[PDB]
Amino acid sequence: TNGTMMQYFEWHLPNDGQHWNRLRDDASNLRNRGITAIWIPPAWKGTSQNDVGYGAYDLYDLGEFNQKGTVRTKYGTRSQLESAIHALKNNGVQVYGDVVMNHKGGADATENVLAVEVNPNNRNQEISGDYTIEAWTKFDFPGRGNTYSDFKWRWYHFDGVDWDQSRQFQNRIYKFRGDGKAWDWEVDSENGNYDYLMYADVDMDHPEVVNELRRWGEWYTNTLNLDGFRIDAVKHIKYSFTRDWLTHVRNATGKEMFAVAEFWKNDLGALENYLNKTNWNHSVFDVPLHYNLYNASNSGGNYDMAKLLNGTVVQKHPMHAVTFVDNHDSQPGESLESFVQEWFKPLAYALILTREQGYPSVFYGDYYGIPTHSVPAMKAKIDPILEARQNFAYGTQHDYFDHHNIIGWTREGNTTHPNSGLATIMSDGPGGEKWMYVGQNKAGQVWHDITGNKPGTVTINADGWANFSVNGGSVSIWVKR
Ligand SMILES: [Ca+2]
Ligand SMILES: [Ca+2]
Ligand SMILES: [Ca+2]
Ligand code: NA
Numbered sequence: 423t424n425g426t427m428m429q430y431f432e433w434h435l436p437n438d439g440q441h442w443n444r445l446r447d448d449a450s451n452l453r454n455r456g457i458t459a460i461w462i463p464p465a466w467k468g469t470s471q472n473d474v475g476y477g478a479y480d481l482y483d484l485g486e487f488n489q490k491g492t493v494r495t496k497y498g499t500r501s502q503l504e505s506a507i508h509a510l511k512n513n514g515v516q517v518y519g520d521v522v523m524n525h526k527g528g529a530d531a532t533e534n535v536l537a538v539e540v541n542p543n544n545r546n547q548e549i550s551g552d553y554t555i556e557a558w559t560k561f562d563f564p565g566r567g568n569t570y571s572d573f574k575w576r577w578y579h580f581d582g583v584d585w586d587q588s589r590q591f592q593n594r595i596y597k598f599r600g601d602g603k604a605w606d607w608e609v610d611s612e613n614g615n616y617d618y619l620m621y622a623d624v625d626m627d628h629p630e631v632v633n634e635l636r637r638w639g640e641w642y643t644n645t646l647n648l649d650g651f652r653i654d655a656v657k658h659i660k661y662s663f664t665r666d667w668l669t670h671v672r673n674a675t676g677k678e679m680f681a682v683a684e685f686w687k688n689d690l691g692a693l694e695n696y697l698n699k700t701n702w703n704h705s706v707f708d709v710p711l712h713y714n715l716y717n718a719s720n721s722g723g724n725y726d727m728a729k730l731l732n733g734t735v736v737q738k739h740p741m742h743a744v745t746f747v748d749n750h751d752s753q754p755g756e757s758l759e760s761f762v763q764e765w766f767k768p769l770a771y772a773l774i775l776t777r778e779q780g781y782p783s784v785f786y787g788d789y790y791g792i793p794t795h796s797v798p799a800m801k802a803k804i805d806p807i808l809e810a811r812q813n814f815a816y817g818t819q820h821d822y823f824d825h826h827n828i829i830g831w832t833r834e835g836n837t838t839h840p841n842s843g844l845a846t847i848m849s850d851g852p853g854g855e856k857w858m859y860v861g862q863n864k865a866g867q868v869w870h871d872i873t874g875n876k877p878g879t880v881t882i883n884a885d886g887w888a889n890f891s892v893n894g895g896s897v898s899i900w901v902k903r
Contacts, residue, residue, distance in 0.1 A: 424811050425781055426456050427518070427682075429652075431463035431497075432787030433750040434794040437472040441497035442485075446506035449513050455805060456812030457784065459516035459680075461652040462506075463497055469528030472496055474750070475520065476654065477621065479528035480563050481638050482570040484646070489565030490528055507646055516649035518680070519642060523635050523667070524655040526575060527621035529558035532587045535577040537596040544614035545595060545605055552599050556587035559622050570641065573634050581605055581625045582618055602627060608699055610657035610687065619658040626660035632667075639671040643679065650680035653704070656696065657685045665700035682706065682744040682781075686751060686758060688713040690733050697742055705781065708735040708743045712760070715747060715773070719766030723851030723895065728823040730773065740779035747771055748785045754795040761797075768803045768873070769848040769897040775811040776846045776899060777831060778819045782811070806873045810899045814872070816842040820859050827851035830890065834861035841902045845869070845880075847890045848897035855891045862886030864902075871898040879903060 430445055445460065452460070464475020467483035471492035483489055486500040493499060498506075507517050535557040539550035561575035582597040582605070595618050597605060605617035606626045617623060625631055642648065656664050664683065672679045681704035685696045690710050697706065711734040718725040736743035747770040751758040762770050767788060774782035784804065791799035817834040828849045835843030845858050860869075864882040871877070876898045880888045892898040 423456060423458060424815055425458045426775070426784065426808065426811060427459040427461060427744065427781060428452065428457045428784040428786065428789070429746070429749055430460050430786050431474075431750065432785070432792055433474060433753055433756055434792060435463075435496065437496050439494045439496070439498045439502075442502035442506040443498060446502075446509040449506070449509035449515060453513035453515050455808045457515065457808075459518055459649070460510055461518040461682075461783070462520065464520045464522055465495065465497070465503055465646065467492075467495060476522055477527040478522040479526065480561070480566060481522075481642065483563070483566055487563075487566040487569070489563065503646070511647070516680075517646065518650040518652050518682075519646060519648040520654060521651045522654040523624060524619055524658045525621040525623050526561060526580075529560055529575075529622060530562045530564065531558075531560035532556045533559045533577045535559065536599040537582070537586075538599060540582070540595050540597050540618075542593060542595050542613065545597070545616070545618055546614035548597070555583075555589065555596055557583045557596065557598075557622070558585060558587065559583065571634075571638065573630075579625055579628055579631050580622045582623050584618070584620065606660040606663070608661045609659065610685075610692065612687070616658050617660075619655055624659075626663040632663065636667055636670045636674075639667060640674045643671060643675045643677065648679070649677070651682070653681055653683040656683040657687060657692075661696060661699040665703055668700075668704055680705070684751075685709065690735065690738065693735055694739075697739065702742060705742045705744050706735060707749070707783070708745045708780065710734045711736055711743075711745055711774075712747070712752060712762075715762045715766070715770045716752070716760045718850055719763035719770070721850065723827060725850055726826045727829045727848070727850050728826055730829065731823065736780035743780040744783050745774035745780040746783040746785060747774065748788055749783075750787065753787050753792060754797065764798070764800070765895050766850065767800055768807065769850065771804050771807050772810070772846050772848060772897040772899060775807045776815045776833070776844060778815070778833070784808070803873070807899065810844055810846070810872055810901065813839060814842050814844040814899075814901045817861070822856060822858055825856070828854050828856055828892065830856050830858055830892075832858045832860045834864075843902060844872075845888070845890045845900040846897065847892040847900070849892050849894055851894060853892045853894040853896065855889045857887055857889050859885070859887050868903045869900045870903045872901045873897065873899050
């Protein structure tokens, strides 16, 4: 089959400890609809039970220990997680674990640390003398003791923080002083140096940090029997660290470990740099495409659809692109809000799912909805497109990004997938038609719109061509009836 990944969470999931169960109970159905890989939410203990997991407190506490006021994570207990992972494995579905190494939050205790303030707008600029702050840097994990790992985090494992417990000033970032202390590099250059993001920033220059994060990497992989990784916040983590951490873990575990990194920047040049700097050893989410999609969805039909793939990872480097419509960062109300409007969402999914380029990701928030923000489940509309991908989107592709409203592509199908072959056609504006070539061996085949957006049929002519149609603001995916 074609590989399809799913982000199986959104920001505003209920804190009911029942998410690992939902996943478990969804494993079969998801595999049957062609989902071949699940990126699971952060599996470890956050700063609290309701933390989505990115407030990463204890990477070794997978809802196992009584820490931060809870045993389970937001999603459930460790044993629930294993049952769900097992459900996925029995179905041949891959498990991609989230990976949050940029920072740690929810420290157990503070330390007095000699620090320097930096300009939040340019973290390269030191804007104060040295002075001592009270910094949240001591991680002893008292609920876990030394089970799994005896490693204790101290100030010297971090580069800096955004809070002085003794003074409690807002809007400050503190770089730690000491021999060898500097924001890491290379990282994104926004704000001069974007090493600092939040909480206690991990010092990727510290040998103990490197050694520890590498071994946790193995432990995490071995423990949960992960198949790959979704890597969090990679523009704020020393690029060479990520590259080598990944190689370390693949070396140590003997596993392929597919990885996709969240390098969130609407900037192909920047993503390319990151890919070069990480030796092309893993994929990045196609953030530029996400923005193209969002922009398109906001343009009232005025977007030039022929340019929808322009400036994107999937157009230039599709083998290193994971394509996605939305994620928890872009969802309504979140830090990077840029949610693809509902009318356009099917077209976006048809784009990522029915083309041969890139490794498409389905957003839980899109699929099952975001009830907190009145975003409907769009499973009813996505399902036909996943069926297209699963059973029809095979063989030679023919692109027709040749109109500013009406674009489409066909797939000739192949012999391994019987009756495979499709013609996707979408319009961000008024509907219409387009002659597309689906293969001459398809001659006289009667085709219909698997989305049911367009009623009726289209019959492949003798040349292997048909005039496929689409409604306005819509997508049709024609397949053999
Ligand atoms: Ca550093
Ligand atoms: Ca960092
Ligand atoms: Ca248009
Ligand atoms: Na750092």
